[PDB]
Amino acid sequence: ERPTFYRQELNKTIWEVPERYQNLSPVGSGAYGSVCAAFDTKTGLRVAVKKLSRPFQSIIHAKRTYRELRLLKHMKHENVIGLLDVFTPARSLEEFNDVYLVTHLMGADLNNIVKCQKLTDDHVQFLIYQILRGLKYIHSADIIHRDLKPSNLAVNEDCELKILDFGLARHTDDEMTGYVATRWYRAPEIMLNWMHYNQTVDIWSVGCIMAELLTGRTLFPGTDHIDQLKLILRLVGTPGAELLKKISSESARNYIQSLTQMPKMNFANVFIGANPLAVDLLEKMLVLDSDKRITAAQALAHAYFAQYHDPDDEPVADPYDQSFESRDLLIDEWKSLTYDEVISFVPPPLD
Ligand SMILES: O=C(Nc1ccc2[nH]ccc2c1)c1cc(F)cc(N2CCOCC2)c1
């Protein structure tokens, strides 16, 4: 029942994988892992194999590893990354030190789509529809992406889309600093730590992405946190008393009140020539008060998507138990939980 593994050194890294995976070829690497393209001879699929780097070197790392495996095993939706396989060459918990994750080989992301091709309004409709379809699904499980951006959206030749999270980087203060795409899609409340955030942080991101699909340009390309906030407030207007109240931070609240008050702009005069239905949806997503933003489920029933909307084919997720997130365990306990999840993995059906 345990497959045969073979060894191979690729870019100073040892890969021990089941024989089914052939033609391994380095594709990427970072702080959390190294990635190879391969051909899965069992399924006929081109796949990406990610070897996690030092998955159990600290408590934080071990919990992270467990978290990713739990999320990936849970997500089963056409518009979200699916786990094809997970394995370890280890024959026992005692020798368990490496975890490999397998998924469909991406190809293009939305970033190279928007930069390299012309998108009609029909393409924008279809692409955003699919992001929202996936978000309805993850949000139904109380899973928040928090880092939706074009580089995290995979798109095939037929314009079919999946949501993933590549973040092999640790998301430090420095990488959020300056003129960086890493921050341009982030909701203002998380960018500035205004308050406890909710799942409509992801809807803000969708609005930023949709705007960029329509114009071909970044909506809020700030040169730093403050410059970006000024771009935002210029479009959407400065907050009123009602939203200010909700900003828990006192200093953050005092800074906002130092700003000259600005009204919401006319979106038809920003997104010149866009479908009026697209403009209306943008106005409902790019709302400063996260309590008042449209949700994924509400947006799927918006008239902009009339061509694609099918309420019998917009499924929700099975319940996802996240109690582990509030739990403090030792490295070896997180490691043993992870090992159990590796061993118990069951592959999805073929077709
Ligand atoms: O995409 C992810 N992992 C990933 C990336 C590239 C890979 N190559 C081979 C395996 C592999 C795994 C990923 C990880 C997560 F922790 C959460 C989410 N989700 C996505 C859906 O929204 C919630 C966050 C996606």
From Swiss-Prot:
Which Gene Ontology molecular function entries are recorded, alphabetically? ATP binding; enzyme binding; MAP kinase activity; MAP kinase kinase activity; mitogen-activated protein kinase p38 binding; NFAT protein binding; protein phosphatase binding; protein serine kinase activity
Catalytic site positions: 165
Q: Which family does it belong to?
A: Belongs to the protein kinase superfamily. CMGC Ser/Thr protein kinase family. MAP kinase subfamily.
Task: Report domain Protein kinase positions.
Answer: 21-305
Q: What Gene Ontology cellular-component terms does the record carry?
A: cytoplasm; cytosol; extracellular region; ficolin-1-rich granule lumen; glutamatergic synapse; mitochondrion; nuclear speck; nucleoplasm
Q: Which CDD domains match?
A: STKc_p38alpha
- What does the PTM comment state? Dually phosphorylated on Thr-177 and Tyr-179 by the MAP2Ks MAP2K3/MKK3, MAP2K4/MKK4 and MAP2K6/MKK6 in response to inflammatory citokines, environmental stress or growth factors, which activates the enzyme. Dual phosphorylation can also be mediated by TAB1-mediated autophosphorylation. TCR engagement in T-cells also leads to Tyr-320 phosphorylation by ZAP70. Dephosphorylated and inactivated by DUPS1, DUSP10 and DUSP16. PPM1D also mediates dephosphorylation and inactivation of MAPK14.
Gene that encodes the chain: MAPK14
Domain of life per record:
Eukaryota
Per UniProt, activity regulation is: Activated by cell stresses such as DNA damage, heat shock, osmotic shock, anisomycin and sodium arsenite, as well as pro-inflammatory stimuli such as bacterial lipopolysaccharide (LPS) and interleukin-1. Activation occurs through dual phosphorylation of Thr-177 and Tyr-179 by either of two dual specificity kinases, MAP2K3/MKK3 or MAP2K6/MKK6, and potentially also MAP2K4/MKK4, as well as by TAB1-mediated autophosphorylation.
Entry protein name: Mitogen-activated protein kinase 14
UniProt keyword annotation of Acetylation present? yes
- Needed cofactors: Mg(2+)
Q: Which residues carry this modification: Phosphotyrosine?
A: 179, 320
Protein species of origin: Homo sapiens
The record's subcellular location field reads: Cytoplasm; Nucleus
Describe what happens upon changing residue 319 to R.
Answer: In a lung adenocarcinoma sample; somatic mutation
| Result after altering residue 66 to H | Lowered kinase activity
